[PDB]
Amino acid sequence: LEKFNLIDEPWIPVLKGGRVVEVGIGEALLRAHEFARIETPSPLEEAVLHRLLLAVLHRALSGPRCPEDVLDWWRKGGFPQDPIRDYLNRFRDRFFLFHPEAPFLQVADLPEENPLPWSKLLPELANLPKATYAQAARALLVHQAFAPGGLLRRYGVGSAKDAPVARPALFLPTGQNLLETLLLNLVPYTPEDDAPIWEVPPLRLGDLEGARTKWPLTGRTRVYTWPARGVRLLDEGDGVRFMGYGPGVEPLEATHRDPMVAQRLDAKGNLLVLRLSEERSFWRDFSAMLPRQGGKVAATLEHAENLQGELEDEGLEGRITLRVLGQVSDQAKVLDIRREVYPLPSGLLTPKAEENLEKALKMAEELGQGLKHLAQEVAKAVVYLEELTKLANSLPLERLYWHALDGAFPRFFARVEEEASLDLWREALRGAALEAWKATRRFLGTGARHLKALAQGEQEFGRLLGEL
């Protein structure tokens, strides 16, 4: 009845001594330094597991109030243990996956009748097995953070809203062990006016039907642990197949921006979240998220960058990277789920580095626009408005330019501080363009009808390279 406490049971997959083991929240926190990282094939799982741990840390430590505190914990090789133990002991009865009164992130009195398969908790890209408790716990957490809005038609609610991070790309700086990673994401915090889901009374069906409960979407840990859907996992005895399901605390608009989320301006000066895109390389938005461009850097990245500087002034230099986690989405559809890894350059947020990044990205965009135009002129020379489309799209020119730069970007990015770095980039731009046009020649060189386009294109491509 009372079963499977997330503080003590193995459900969090972490890499330890080269193998994947599963731990509970207590061990993950108190012994963070022992694990290389949270290790899962799912980038959504990785994102939410860190956000849950961070929620717990922020509340248990009532901070960190200052970056200096994070540095201390870095130096000591661990978090304060007693505050964490005390907090976990106080809220332990709220961390049972199954519970007659307060099951974790669930609604105790959702009816068991006419349930949905637990598979609904999982992303559907573009019979039914029994989940273990650990897998149901993880699927629950993912669903509460990433469920896209859409049709619901249950308990008086026609359609549900987006869970809090359904859309944006999440910035997760990463260190050499789980302790470092948590520290790199522990942005200075004060507890006032915030509370995670387990610090407030359990939700009941009567509060959720017709969407009666509406909360402003604010408060760091309230947002990290947002109850986006009503869920009640049903215990088969040693696993889960089905769940009660309904709304949904309604998100009300607020000024709060999630620490892992970055923003940019659109052409009209509206602020939009950075978002993973189906075909557009993500790093292409890295200069637009900068304030100098009207954008906003993710707080985790601002904090990690600052921490990285302070560790440098102490000779405590460590190996720090940037993971980007999120969904590629389209309304109620989840097209894809992605994990991206980038270096996290030491001086990234200085004026010179920012200046270099701005230029590097601008060159790459101008050339890519020249290439796109070239591809359009080739297609037209060859050839109904449907015919052109397939043709230009089928040409390997733009795809290969950008694909080549995806490989070149990390090398440049790691050196964004150095003046020399633009030159490396220009070299990479040249090779990317040359490599991509070579491949288009190869394509154009096989048909007699392709030859006019080819002669014209080679000349235009010559123009483009010159200006570089």
From Swiss-Prot:
The keyword Glycosyltransferase does not apply. The keyword Calcium does not apply. Keywords: Antiviral defense, Plasmid. InterPro entries: CRISPR-assoc_prot_Cse1. Belongs to the CRISPR associated protein CasA/Cse1 family. Type I-E/Ecoli subfamily. CRISPR (clustered regularly interspaced short palindromic repeat), is an adaptive immune system that provides protection against mobile genetic elements (viruses, transposable elements and conjugative plasmids). CRISPR clusters contain sequences complementary to antecedent mobile elements and target invading nucleic acids. CRISPR clusters are transcribed and processed into CRISPR RNA (crRNA). A component of Cascade, which participates in CRISPR interference, the third stage of CRISPR immunity. Cascade binds both crRNA and in a sequence-specific manner negatively supercoiled dsDNA target. This leads to the formation of an R-loop in which the crRNA binds the target DNA, displacing the noncomplementary strand. Cas3 is recruited to Cascade, probably via interactions with CasA, nicks target DNA and then unwinds and cleaves the target, leading to DNA degradation and invader neutralization. Monomer. Part of the Cascade ribonucleoprotein complex. Interacts directly with the 5' end of crRNA, CasB, CasD and CasE. Binding of target ssRNA or dsDNA causes a conformational change in the Cascade complex; CasA is required for high affinity target DNA binding. Interacts with Cas3 once Cascade has recognized target DNA. This is CRISPR-associated protein CasA/Cse1. It comes from Thermus thermophilus (strain ATCC 27634 / DSM 579 / HB8).
